[PDB]
């Protein structure tokens, strides 16, 4: 995942975790 | 001012962070 990526295998804001979602 | 989660923490995360998912 992107994701994961972003999140797991680094550290993110609280808004690129949001902007990971779906709309 | 950072967040980091892997596995099923990411998960639940997305889970209540996303009005409608992440599919």
Known sequence: ?23 | NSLRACGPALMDMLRVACPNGFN
Do not use: E, I, P, Q
């Not at chain 1, 995942?1 to 709309?23: E, I, K, P």
């Open chain 1, 1 to 23: 995942r992107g994701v994961v990526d972003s999140c797991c295998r680094n550290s993110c804001s609280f808004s690129t975790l949001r902007a990971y979602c779906d709309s």
